[PDB]
Every structure is written in structure tokens, then in C-alpha cells.
Amino acid sequence: EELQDDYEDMMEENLEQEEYEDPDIPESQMEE
């Protein structure tokens, strides 16, 4: 506690690289 942000993995999670990506345009085709 109070020092987890000093580590690379925690910083990676904090910066959230996924939030700068286009996730997807879901369609969910009604048929199958």
C-alpha cells in the first residue's frame, strides 16, 4: 500500500492501454 504504483505492472494497469484502442463494433447477428 502507498507504493504499488512504483511498479511496472501496476503502472501499466493504471495507464489503461486498452482505453486508447477501438474495442469492437458488435453486431450480434440475430440468426445463427
Partner: protein, 451 residues
């Protein structure tokens, strides 16, 4: 007499007396007969405040004693965990070798200082650097019987530096003093983390304006582009850091830079509903029609996030209301898919076409009926959405609702005069769709109608 008194104050932790001596004019780099300067003496005794103050006063961090020991060597041998942490934060070389080849990790391991060994390993201490005799930290730990130290050394192995670089840590804390010392030692403000981000990226994420100004004044690249393409401006716009965005724009940040998925900073601002940042970027020339890899413009992202005011601002700046993604989804399609009826109301009041067709012929009404978004459905039907529009497969909104089993949608559609006897490309009615999915209530309402 003055230098001797200063060194005695450093050993005893008398920070006031040492500071008064330094104010008088005593050389801060003065050392005793053994080559121990004030930093060495303070590090031996664990005087953390004295160490910090002397570092702020520009003591040479890697000065060695007559045996080749730096301050980090002495802190590790003395087992001063706080001092070791502080020295490493200010740029101490964790792999420094004394005259006889001892490293700080070796000194910590021989003395059974588990916390120091762990911290040094996490900071990239190399446990394979041997002494002149050929002994490693593991070898001395085994000889002295320090079982915990041996176990930690074996387990860590070569996991490497898992802490951030010191300048990244300073940037995270907005620590201008530590950053100034680090940059005095290492003039590279663009030091890289394992993930590829510079300290300016960290400063922009946390809106640490002071350290960001220091980094930019020391040659940091305002436009640094990692592999993923996330510049500091992208981070500032995504986080809603208005003041950081203004600072970065003033120092030459590019407005039109694209990430790996082709998101501009305006895309990041709109996606999180940051109205002021979106306005600033637009006023600085950000292209309002920029498209991601999937063909999403900022209005699409604003609609996707239910960011009503961001949608309003983008429309006020001449955003194309009927812009289409690669799937031919308009912002109205996105709003119907996510159930955001407020965004849909704003879009339709501004002239969005209520009968736009997606790639499979789905209209916004079709999507709203699929997802059971009744409020979007009522708005669309009240603003001229066709209730009998068919997709390519011949599906009406009633077909979709009956298949999904959304009873309120089916009820409302039938009450507004939707024929239940329409047919698909296969001659299949809403009743067929209800039967196929076993939605007994929807089938019962359909049959109580003229199905």
C-alpha cells in the same frame, strides 16, 4: 574545524547544525580521513532527512570512500532500508562495485538484510556480478546460512527491474526536487519504462503540472510516440486533464496524431465526455471527422458513452450527424444500440435520419427493438421512424422483438398499429419467431391480436 563539525553533524543527524554549516560555506563534498563524506555518514546511521537534504544540496551521489563504497554500499551494509530506498529514488547505481568487487546486493545478502535484498532485486540489481574472489550474493548468503536471503535470491532469479525508473516515480508524485536531482545526474528526460512510456506520459496521466513543466524545460519530447502510438496529449485528453492539455498544446503537441487503432486526441476526449477538452482541441484544429480503424468518428464515441453535452458540442462544431462507420452505423444507430435515448433525442432534434440502414438493413428502430430499449423506440416512432421497415432478411421491428421475447416492445408495437402477419424472406411471421424461441407471453399477446 568547520568541515569536521559538519561531518560530525552528518553522523549524528543534526540537520540544523549541518545546514547552518553549509550556509556558512563548508564544502558539501568534504570527507573525513576514510573518504566518508556527509552523505556516507548519514547513510550509515539511517538519517533519512539528512540524506534527502544533502542530495537536494547537490552532493555527488556516486562519490566513493577509500574502499570504493558509495553511499548505497554503506546503506546496504548497515541495513538501512529507508536510506537505500531514498538513494535508489535519487538515482543511486544499484550495480556499483567497490574496490574488492562487492555490490550493494552482496553487502545486503552477507548481512542478512532481507528487505534491502528484495528492494535491490526489484530495482535491477544483478545477482551474478561476482567479487574479485569469484563469490556471488547467493554464495555468501549460503556460506553465512542466511536461509531467507538465499531463498529470495533463488526465487527472484533474473526477473529484472520490476520497479519503474526513478524519474517515472518522481513524475507520478509530482516530485520536482527528486526529478531535478535525477535530471542533474541523468540528462535524459525521455527515459523509457519497460512498457515504453516516458515520465511525461506519467505526468500527463496524473496532471502533475510542475514535474511536466520541469520535464519539458529539460528537453522532454512533447510528442513522444511509443509503439502503441499513445502520446502525452492522448493521455491528457483521455483523462480529462484540461490544464495538462493546454500545457502540452502550448509546447507543440500534435493535434492530429493517431494511436495504433487510429484514435486522435479528440477521439479520446469525446469517448470520455470531456467537453472542455474537446472544445480546446477543436479550436486548435483537431479534425472533427477523423475516423478510427472501424470508421468511428468522435460523435460516434460520444454517443457510445452517453455523453450528451459532448454530442451537443460536436454537432455545434459541424460534425456530420449521419456519419457512418464501416458497418454503416450512424450515431443514431449507436445510441439505439446502447439505449441512450437522450443522445437519440438530441440527434433526431438536429435532423438525424430516423430510417438509416446499416449493412444488414437494420434501422435504429430495429436495433432498439432488439435490445429492449423502449424509450429509444418511442422517440424514434414519434420522430418519423417507419414501423414497418424491413431488413434485408425481411425482418420488421415486430419480428425482432418477438424473436428476442421483449414483451413491452411487442405490446407497444402492436398498440401503435404494427401488422403481426408480415413475413420474412422465409415466410415466417412474428408468431413463428416467438414459437421458435419459446416466448410464451409474446406468442400469447400475438395470438390475442390478429396473428
Amino acid at each position: 574545524d568547520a568541515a569536521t563539525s559538519f561531518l560530525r553533524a552528518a553522523r549524528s543527524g543534526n540537520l540544523d547544525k549541518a545546514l547552518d554549516h553549509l550556509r556558512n560555506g563548508v564544502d558539501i563534498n568534504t570527507c573525513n580521513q576514510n573518504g566518508l563524506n556527509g552523505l556516507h555518514l548519514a547513510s550509515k546511521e539511517g538519517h533519512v532527512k539528512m540524506v534527502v537534504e544533502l542530495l537536494h544540496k547537490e552532493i555527488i551521489l556516486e562519490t566513493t570512500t577509500k574502499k570504493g563504497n558509495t553511499a548505497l554500499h554503506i546503506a546496504a551494509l548497515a541495513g538501512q532500508d529507508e536510506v537505500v530506498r531514498e538513494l535508489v529514488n535519487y538515482g543511486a547505481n544499484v550495480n556499483a562495485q567497490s574496490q574488492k568487487g562487492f555490490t550493494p546486493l552482496y553487502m545486503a545478502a552477507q548481512e542478512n538484510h532481507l528487505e534491502v535484498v528484495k528492494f535491490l532485486l526489484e530495482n535491477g540489481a544483478n545477482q551474478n556480478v561476482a567479487t574479485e574472489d569469484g563469490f556471488t550474493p547467493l554464495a555468501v548468503a549460503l556460506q553465512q546460512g542466511h536461509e531467507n536471503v538465499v531463498a529470495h535470491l533463488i526465487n527472484y532469479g533474473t526477473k529484472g527491474k520490476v520497479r519503474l525508473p526513478a524519474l517515472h516515480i518522481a513524475a507520478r508524485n509530482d516530485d520536482t526536487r527528486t526529478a531535478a536531482v535525477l535530471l542533474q545526474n541523468d540528462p535524459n528526460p525521455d527515459v523509457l519504462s519497460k512498457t515504453g512510456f516516458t515520465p511525461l506520459h506519467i505526468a500527463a496521466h496524473y496532471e502533475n503540472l510542475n514535474v511536466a513543466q520541469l520535464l519539458l524545460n529539460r528537453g522532454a519530447s512533447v510528442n513522444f510516440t511509443p509503439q502503441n502510438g499513445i502520446t502525452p496529449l492522448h493521455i491528457a485528453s483521455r483523462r480529462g486533464n484540461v490544464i495538462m492539455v493546454r500545457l502540452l498544446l502550448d509546447r507543440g503537441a500534435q493535434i492530429e496524431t493517431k494511436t495504433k487503432d487510429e484514435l486522435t486526441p479528440l477521439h479520446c476526449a469525446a469517448r470520455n465526455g470531456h467537453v472542455r477538452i474537446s472544445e480546446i482541441l477543436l479550436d486548435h484544429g483537431a479534425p472533427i471527422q477523423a475516423k478510427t480503424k472501424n470508421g468511428l468518428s468522435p460523435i460516434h464515441m460520444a454517443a457510445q458513452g452517453d455523453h450528451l453535452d459532448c454530442v451537443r458540442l460536436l454537432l455545434q462544431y459541424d460534425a456530420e450527424i449521419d456519419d457512418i462507420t464501416l458497418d454503416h452505423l450512424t450515431p443514431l444507430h449507436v445510441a439505439a444500440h446502447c439505449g441512450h435515448h437522450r443522445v437519440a433525442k438530441v440527434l433526431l432534434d438536429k435532423g438525424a435520419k430516423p430510417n438509416s440502414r446499416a449493412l444488414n438493413g437494420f434501422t435504429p428502430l430495429h436495433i432498439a427493438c432488439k435490445k429492449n430499449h423502449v424509450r429509444v423506440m418511442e422517440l424514434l416512432l414519434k420522430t418519423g421512424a417507419s414501423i414497418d421497415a424491413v431488413t434485408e432478411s425481411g425482418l420488421t421491428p415486430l419480428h425482432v422483438a418477438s424473436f428476442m421475447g421483449h414483451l413491452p416492445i411487442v405490446k407497444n408495437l402492436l398498440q401503435r398499429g404494427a401488422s403481426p402477419n408480415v413475413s420474412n424472406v422465409k415466410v415466417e411471421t412474428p408468431l413463428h419467431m416467438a414459437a421458435r424461441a419459446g416466448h410464451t407471453e409474446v406468442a400469447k399477446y400475438l395470438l390475442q391480436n390478429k396473428a
